[PDB]
Amino acid sequence: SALGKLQDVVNQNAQALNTLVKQLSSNFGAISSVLNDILSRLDKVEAEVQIDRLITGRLQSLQTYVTQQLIRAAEIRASANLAATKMSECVLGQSKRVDFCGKGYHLMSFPQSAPHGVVFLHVTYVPAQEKNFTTAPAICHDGKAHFPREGVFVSNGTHWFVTQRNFYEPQIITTDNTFVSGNCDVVIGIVNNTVYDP
Amino acid sequence: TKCTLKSFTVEKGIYQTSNFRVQPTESIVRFPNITNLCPFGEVFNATRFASVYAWNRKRISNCVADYSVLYNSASFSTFKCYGVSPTKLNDLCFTNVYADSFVIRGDEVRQIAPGQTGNIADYNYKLPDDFTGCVIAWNSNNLDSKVGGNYNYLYRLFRKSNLKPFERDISTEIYQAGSTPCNGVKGFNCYFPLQSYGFQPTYGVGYQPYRVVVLSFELLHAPATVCGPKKSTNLVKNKCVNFNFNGLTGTGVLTESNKKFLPFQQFGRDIADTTDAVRDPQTLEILDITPCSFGGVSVITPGTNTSNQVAVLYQGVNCTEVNVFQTRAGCLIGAEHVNNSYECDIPIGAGICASYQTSQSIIAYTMSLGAENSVAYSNNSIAIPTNFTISVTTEILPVSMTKTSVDCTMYICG
Amino acid sequence: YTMSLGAENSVAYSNNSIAIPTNFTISVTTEILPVSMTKTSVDCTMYICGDSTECSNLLLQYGSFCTQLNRALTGIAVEQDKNTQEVFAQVKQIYKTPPIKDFGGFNFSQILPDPSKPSKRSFIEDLLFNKVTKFNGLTVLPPLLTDEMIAQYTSALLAGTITSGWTFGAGAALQIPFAMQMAYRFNGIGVTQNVLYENQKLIANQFNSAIGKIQDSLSSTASALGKLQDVVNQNAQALNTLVKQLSSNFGAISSVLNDILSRLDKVEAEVQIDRLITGRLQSLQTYVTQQLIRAAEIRASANLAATKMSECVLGQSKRVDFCGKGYHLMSFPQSAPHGVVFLHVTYVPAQEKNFTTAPAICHDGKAHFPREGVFVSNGTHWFVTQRNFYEPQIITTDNTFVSGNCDVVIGIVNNTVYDP
Amino acid sequence: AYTNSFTRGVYYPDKVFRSSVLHSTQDLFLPFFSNVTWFHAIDNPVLPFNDGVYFASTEKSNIIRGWIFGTTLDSKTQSLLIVNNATNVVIKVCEFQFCNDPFLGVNCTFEYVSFKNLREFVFKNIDGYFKIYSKHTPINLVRDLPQGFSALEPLVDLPIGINITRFQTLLALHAAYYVGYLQPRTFLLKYNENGTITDAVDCALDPLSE
Structure with missing residues (x-):
C-alpha cells in the first residue's frame, strides 16, 4: 500500500483505456454500435446518417480521452519537476529546506527506480532524548558581557556550560569560546559566572 | 455499491451509488373549471369559411374538448401537427387556440405548412417558420362546388411583396405586373390582384375545393383558457408529491408560501428560471416549491474481503425525511456512534470518521487531530537532546505514464 | 499616460566605497494563498435528466460519460481534503500554549488562539473570516476538517513556533525562551545575537506595532482578501453559469425537459431530447474540464502553501523572496476561508551611511581580511563590521585572517592591525 | 417644448415571481434620459404610434379621459x-364616429367597460397582441416628470389585430401631458x-x- 501512487497511475491508464474501449459498445442513437451492421443492413444514402452518429459519438469519446490525458500528463510533469528537483537537491547534494528531502533535518538521499515512477530513500536526522536545563542569553564576567561564538549557555544547577544547539555537548565558558560584547548593563536575563582564560 | 463500481469485490471506503430522492407520494392535477365544450364541432362542420386572402382567425377560448373526436374523425382528407402530437392534445392546456380557416383548391392545400411556397402561402396566409399548431382540411367538392362553377370562392393571385407570418390583406387595388403605370386602370401588365376558383363538381382533385383549418396555438404563463377533457383532483400541501398545474407537470414539496406574489403572477421561477412557485387555478393558493429531499447515497463500508456489513450516509438529509445517527453532513444510518476520538480511517465530513471493529460493528466518531501537548515554556527554560537517531522515510513519486497512441481513423472507422 | 517603472536611481558605484546601514526595521509583510475550492458534486443524471425516466434510459446511448463525470468531480473533491490536510496537518502533535506570556515583550495576543472565546480563532483570523462573502442536481459536500480543527492546527503550529523554535517540525518541541529564538533568527541573517539583546525593548515594540498595523490594514482594506474572494467568486460564477445553461435550447423546441415530454410523441421527443442531452452533456464536460484545470491551479497554490508552511513557519528560508521580502526572520500562519494567510517577519535595513573601503589591509606587509563582514573607515580610523548593521570593531587578530604578502590585491591599504 | 424622460416608462416584463434577482431581457422600452415632448391643455393632436408609446399627464381637474388609436x-x-369614465374604463374598436373634436360634452367588433395627480401609461404592439x-x-411638480423609480403595472393585452399607425388623446370639456416612443x-x-421589481x-x- 506504500506504493499506492504508482499503482494508482497504472490503474488510471488501464481505467482510461478500458473506458475508451467500452465506449465502442455504446450506440449514441445509432441502430447498432457495430459499424458493419449498418453497412450490411442499410444502403449508402440512408446508412450515412447512422454512421455519422457513430462517428460523432466515438470521436467525442476520443476527444474526452485525449483531454483527460493532457491534464493527467500535466500532473505527472509537475511530479517529474518535483522529482528532478529532489534528485538535484537531495541526491546531488543536501537540502537546507526543512522536510523537502524527507522529514527531519536532512542528511542525504538514495533514488530507486520503479515502473512509471521513482522512489527515494531519504536519510534524515531526528533528535530523541531531551534533558531540561536552565538558560540565560549571556554571561557577565570581569564587568564584560559574554556571548557564545557558537552554541547556548545552560545549567544543570551544579555547573554552567556552553553547548551546541541541537545535541547536548557541554563545555566550560572560556575567553576562547566566548566573544565579548562590551559592558554588562543592557542584556535581559544575563547571569554572573566566571569565564576561564587559558 | 457492487453494481455502481461494476465489480463483485469492493475495498474499505465511502462510495457514491445513487441519490435517494424521497419519493413523490401522490399525483395531484389542477386546472381552471373551464369545462364547457369548445365550438370545434361548429368549426369542423362549418357551413363555409372565407375566401383565403380573408382567412378567418376564429379565436377559440374559455372551454375544453376531447380532441379524439377530431383526430380520429372520418371527415378529414388532411390532419397534420407541429410542436405537438395528437395523443397529447387531451392532456394539453393552452392560453388560446386560433382556427385560421378558409376554402381553396386541393393543389394549394399542400402550400399550407411551414417553409411551403406559392401564392396561397405567399399572398394569402403565411405561417411563422417557428410555428406551433396543426393543419387540417377536408375535400369539399360535395358542397363548395356547383355546376357551371361556384365563383363565390377567391384567392389573391398577385401582390407587390410576400406576406409576413400571420399577415392578412383585403386590398383590391390593381397589381402593376410590369412597366405599365396602371393609375387604377387594368390592361397589359395591370391586373386585378384576386382570382376566382369557379369550383365545378366534375373537377379533378387538383382543382376540387377543400375546407381548411389551421389551429394556431398560444401557450404562455397566463391562465389556460383552453384544455383537453382531463379532470382535476383536490389540492394538497406540505408533502413531497408529483403534480400538474394548468398543464405544467412537476414534482416537489408543495409548501405553504412565504413568497408574496403580485396579483397577476401565475408562477414563480428559480435561478434556473424553472418553475419554483405555483398558483392553484381554482383555489388561488400560492404554493412554494421546496425541493423533495435529495440525499446523495454515500455507502460506507470496510472491504468485502474483511466484512459484509455496511452503513449509509444520505448527504444533507434530516433523518425524519427517510439504528440511526444524524450529522451536519446528513443522515448516517446503520453506523454506531462513539464518544471517544481516534485518528481518522474512513473520512466522512465535518470531522466525522468511521471504521469497522470488534460483536463487530462500524463505529462513527469525531476525529482526533493527534496527541495534545503542553510545552514547558518560560523566560529561562530549555531542553537539549542528549541522543538522536538516523531514519529512512520512503518517498514515492510517479514520473511518467504508459505511452499510448491511437490511430483515430481505425479506432473510429474499423 | 505612460506608466512609471518607479522613480529612477543611479547608484553611485566606485572601486573604493561602500554604503553600510546604521538602523533598520522589523517590518511585517502579509502574504495570502488559496488552498481549496468548494467541494462540488453533480449527479450528471439528475442534472441532465431531472427525474424523467425516459431521458434516464435514453442517456445510456451515450454510455459511461455519466460515470466518468461523477468520477472526475469525486477525484477533485477527494484532493480538496488532501490539500487542506497537507497544508495544516504537517505538525504531528497538538501543542498547546503556556498559561503565561513571558516572551520578553512580544505581544502575540492578537494572533494566538483567543483564550477566552469558545472557538480557538485569533483576533486577526476573526477579521478574515468576517471579511469574505444547488437545488437541481448540483450539491456541495462539507470540508473534512472543521473550521475549528483548522484553528487547532494553526494554533498548534504557532505554539510550537513560539515555545520551541523550528525544532517541533523535525524533532520534539525542544523548548527554549522566545528571546533566545529571535537571537537564532538574527544569527541566521549575519546579525550577531548580541544585537537583539542590545536592542530588545525596541525590537519587540516594533513587532508589536507592526502587528497592530496589520490588524488596521485588514480592518480598513476591503480589497485585502483579493486572492481568496477571487477563488470563491470563480466557482460561484461557474455554477451560476452551469445553472443558467439548463435554460439554453441547444436547438430543441424548449429547454424545459418536462415540456417536450408534455407535448410530444416519443418518436419526436427522442430527437429533441438528443439535442438537450448532447447540449447539457457538452456543458457539463466543459464545466468539469474547467474544474480539473482550476483544481490543478489551486493544487499549485496548495503545494506552494504546504512549502511556505514547511519553510517559513518550520524554519528560516535561505530563498530570497520566498518567505516574504528581504532578510527573513520567521513567519506565522493564520487560517482563512478556502486558504491561508502568512505574516512574514523580516529584518530590513533602512538608515544608510556611506564609507571608504579596501578589500584587504596591510600591517606586516601581509594582507589581512575580514573573517566575516567588510573592512571600513570614516577617515579617522579603520574598522570591520558585520554585513547588514554598522558595528565598527577595531581590526585585530580576533576578527581577521592573513593570506600572504599584499602585492596582488588592488584597492588594499596600510593599517595598524592590533594584537591584545 | 420638452421634459426629460429620466427613468420613466419602465413596466412589468412578465407574469413571473422571482426572488430578489438581477434579471435581464431585451424588449420595447422608453430610452433612458431622452428628451420627450411636452403638451399644454389650452391641445390633443394626432400622433404616430410607431413601435410603442409612453404617455403621462399631470392633472388635478383630471381633464384627460382617454385615447383613440388605429x-x-x-x-x-x-x-x-x-x-376612463370616472369610476370605470370603456374600451371599444368602433366604426361609429363620435364627435369630430373628440371630447365628452360636459356595429363594433369589440366593445367593453371595466397638476399633482400624475397619471402614467405605456402601450406596445406585439404581433397584434397590444x-x-x-x-x-400624487407628485409635487407641474413642469417636469418625477425622477424616482417605479415599474408600471399591466392593464390589458388586446389581441385585436388592428394596424395602429396613429393615435390621439381624449378629454371631458364644455392640465399638462407628455409623450414619447419606445x-x-x-x-x-x-x-x-x-x-x-424595484430598479432597472x-x-x-x-x-x-x-
Missing part, C-alpha cells in the same frame, strides 16, 4: 378607443423578495450601462 381615427373602419401598462400618484432595448432589472438599467444608454 389607421383612420375617423372611424371609417375599426379604431381602438379607451376612456399590451398596456399603467400607474398613477425602442427595442436590452435591460437589467432588480427584483425583491415579494416577486416585485437601460443597457443601451451608454458604455457604463453596457
Whole structure:
C-alpha cells in the first residue's frame, strides 16, 4: 500500500483505456454500435446518417480521452519537476529546506527506480532524548558581557556550560569560546559566572 | 455499491451509488373549471369559411374538448401537427387556440405548412417558420362546388411583396405586373390582384375545393383558457408529491408560501428560471416549491474481503425525511456512534470518521487531530537532546505514464 | 499616460566605497494563498435528466460519460481534503500554549488562539473570516476538517513556533525562551545575537506595532482578501453559469425537459431530447474540464502553501523572496476561508551611511581580511563590521585572517592591525 | 417644448415571481434620459404610434379621459378607443364616429367597460397582441416628470389585430401631458423578495450601462 501512487497511475491508464474501449459498445442513437451492421443492413444514402452518429459519438469519446490525458500528463510533469528537483537537491547534494528531502533535518538521499515512477530513500536526522536545563542569553564576567561564538549557555544547577544547539555537548565558558560584547548593563536575563582564560 | 463500481469485490471506503430522492407520494392535477365544450364541432362542420386572402382567425377560448373526436374523425382528407402530437392534445392546456380557416383548391392545400411556397402561402396566409399548431382540411367538392362553377370562392393571385407570418390583406387595388403605370386602370401588365376558383363538381382533385383549418396555438404563463377533457383532483400541501398545474407537470414539496406574489403572477421561477412557485387555478393558493429531499447515497463500508456489513450516509438529509445517527453532513444510518476520538480511517465530513471493529460493528466518531501537548515554556527554560537517531522515510513519486497512441481513423472507422 | 517603472536611481558605484546601514526595521509583510475550492458534486443524471425516466434510459446511448463525470468531480473533491490536510496537518502533535506570556515583550495576543472565546480563532483570523462573502442536481459536500480543527492546527503550529523554535517540525518541541529564538533568527541573517539583546525593548515594540498595523490594514482594506474572494467568486460564477445553461435550447423546441415530454410523441421527443442531452452533456464536460484545470491551479497554490508552511513557519528560508521580502526572520500562519494567510517577519535595513573601503589591509606587509563582514573607515580610523548593521570593531587578530604578502590585491591599504 | 424622460416608462416584463434577482431581457422600452415632448391643455393632436408609446399627464381637474388609436381615427373602419369614465374604463374598436373634436360634452367588433395627480401609461404592439401598462400618484411638480423609480403595472393585452399607425388623446370639456416612443432595448432589472421589481438599467444608454 506504500506504493499506492504508482499503482494508482497504472490503474488510471488501464481505467482510461478500458473506458475508451467500452465506449465502442455504446450506440449514441445509432441502430447498432457495430459499424458493419449498418453497412450490411442499410444502403449508402440512408446508412450515412447512422454512421455519422457513430462517428460523432466515438470521436467525442476520443476527444474526452485525449483531454483527460493532457491534464493527467500535466500532473505527472509537475511530479517529474518535483522529482528532478529532489534528485538535484537531495541526491546531488543536501537540502537546507526543512522536510523537502524527507522529514527531519536532512542528511542525504538514495533514488530507486520503479515502473512509471521513482522512489527515494531519504536519510534524515531526528533528535530523541531531551534533558531540561536552565538558560540565560549571556554571561557577565570581569564587568564584560559574554556571548557564545557558537552554541547556548545552560545549567544543570551544579555547573554552567556552553553547548551546541541541537545535541547536548557541554563545555566550560572560556575567553576562547566566548566573544565579548562590551559592558554588562543592557542584556535581559544575563547571569554572573566566571569565564576561564587559558 | 457492487453494481455502481461494476465489480463483485469492493475495498474499505465511502462510495457514491445513487441519490435517494424521497419519493413523490401522490399525483395531484389542477386546472381552471373551464369545462364547457369548445365550438370545434361548429368549426369542423362549418357551413363555409372565407375566401383565403380573408382567412378567418376564429379565436377559440374559455372551454375544453376531447380532441379524439377530431383526430380520429372520418371527415378529414388532411390532419397534420407541429410542436405537438395528437395523443397529447387531451392532456394539453393552452392560453388560446386560433382556427385560421378558409376554402381553396386541393393543389394549394399542400402550400399550407411551414417553409411551403406559392401564392396561397405567399399572398394569402403565411405561417411563422417557428410555428406551433396543426393543419387540417377536408375535400369539399360535395358542397363548395356547383355546376357551371361556384365563383363565390377567391384567392389573391398577385401582390407587390410576400406576406409576413400571420399577415392578412383585403386590398383590391390593381397589381402593376410590369412597366405599365396602371393609375387604377387594368390592361397589359395591370391586373386585378384576386382570382376566382369557379369550383365545378366534375373537377379533378387538383382543382376540387377543400375546407381548411389551421389551429394556431398560444401557450404562455397566463391562465389556460383552453384544455383537453382531463379532470382535476383536490389540492394538497406540505408533502413531497408529483403534480400538474394548468398543464405544467412537476414534482416537489408543495409548501405553504412565504413568497408574496403580485396579483397577476401565475408562477414563480428559480435561478434556473424553472418553475419554483405555483398558483392553484381554482383555489388561488400560492404554493412554494421546496425541493423533495435529495440525499446523495454515500455507502460506507470496510472491504468485502474483511466484512459484509455496511452503513449509509444520505448527504444533507434530516433523518425524519427517510439504528440511526444524524450529522451536519446528513443522515448516517446503520453506523454506531462513539464518544471517544481516534485518528481518522474512513473520512466522512465535518470531522466525522468511521471504521469497522470488534460483536463487530462500524463505529462513527469525531476525529482526533493527534496527541495534545503542553510545552514547558518560560523566560529561562530549555531542553537539549542528549541522543538522536538516523531514519529512512520512503518517498514515492510517479514520473511518467504508459505511452499510448491511437490511430483515430481505425479506432473510429474499423 | 505612460506608466512609471518607479522613480529612477543611479547608484553611485566606485572601486573604493561602500554604503553600510546604521538602523533598520522589523517590518511585517502579509502574504495570502488559496488552498481549496468548494467541494462540488453533480449527479450528471439528475442534472441532465431531472427525474424523467425516459431521458434516464435514453442517456445510456451515450454510455459511461455519466460515470466518468461523477468520477472526475469525486477525484477533485477527494484532493480538496488532501490539500487542506497537507497544508495544516504537517505538525504531528497538538501543542498547546503556556498559561503565561513571558516572551520578553512580544505581544502575540492578537494572533494566538483567543483564550477566552469558545472557538480557538485569533483576533486577526476573526477579521478574515468576517471579511469574505444547488437545488437541481448540483450539491456541495462539507470540508473534512472543521473550521475549528483548522484553528487547532494553526494554533498548534504557532505554539510550537513560539515555545520551541523550528525544532517541533523535525524533532520534539525542544523548548527554549522566545528571546533566545529571535537571537537564532538574527544569527541566521549575519546579525550577531548580541544585537537583539542590545536592542530588545525596541525590537519587540516594533513587532508589536507592526502587528497592530496589520490588524488596521485588514480592518480598513476591503480589497485585502483579493486572492481568496477571487477563488470563491470563480466557482460561484461557474455554477451560476452551469445553472443558467439548463435554460439554453441547444436547438430543441424548449429547454424545459418536462415540456417536450408534455407535448410530444416519443418518436419526436427522442430527437429533441438528443439535442438537450448532447447540449447539457457538452456543458457539463466543459464545466468539469474547467474544474480539473482550476483544481490543478489551486493544487499549485496548495503545494506552494504546504512549502511556505514547511519553510517559513518550520524554519528560516535561505530563498530570497520566498518567505516574504528581504532578510527573513520567521513567519506565522493564520487560517482563512478556502486558504491561508502568512505574516512574514523580516529584518530590513533602512538608515544608510556611506564609507571608504579596501578589500584587504596591510600591517606586516601581509594582507589581512575580514573573517566575516567588510573592512571600513570614516577617515579617522579603520574598522570591520558585520554585513547588514554598522558595528565598527577595531581590526585585530580576533576578527581577521592573513593570506600572504599584499602585492596582488588592488584597492588594499596600510593599517595598524592590533594584537591584545 | 420638452421634459426629460429620466427613468420613466419602465413596466412589468412578465407574469413571473422571482426572488430578489438581477434579471435581464431585451424588449420595447422608453430610452433612458431622452428628451420627450411636452403638451399644454389650452391641445390633443394626432400622433404616430410607431413601435410603442409612453404617455403621462399631470392633472388635478383630471381633464384627460382617454385615447383613440388605429389607421383612420375617423372611424371609417375599426379604431381602438379607451376612456376612463370616472369610476370605470370603456374600451371599444368602433366604426361609429363620435364627435369630430373628440371630447365628452360636459356595429363594433369589440366593445367593453371595466397638476399633482400624475397619471402614467405605456402601450406596445406585439404581433397584434397590444399590451398596456399603467400607474398613477400624487407628485409635487407641474413642469417636469418625477425622477424616482417605479415599474408600471399591466392593464390589458388586446389581441385585436388592428394596424395602429396613429393615435390621439381624449378629454371631458364644455392640465399638462407628455409623450414619447419606445425602442427595442436590452435591460437589467432588480427584483425583491415579494416577486416585485424595484430598479432597472437601460443597457443601451451608454458604455457604463453596457
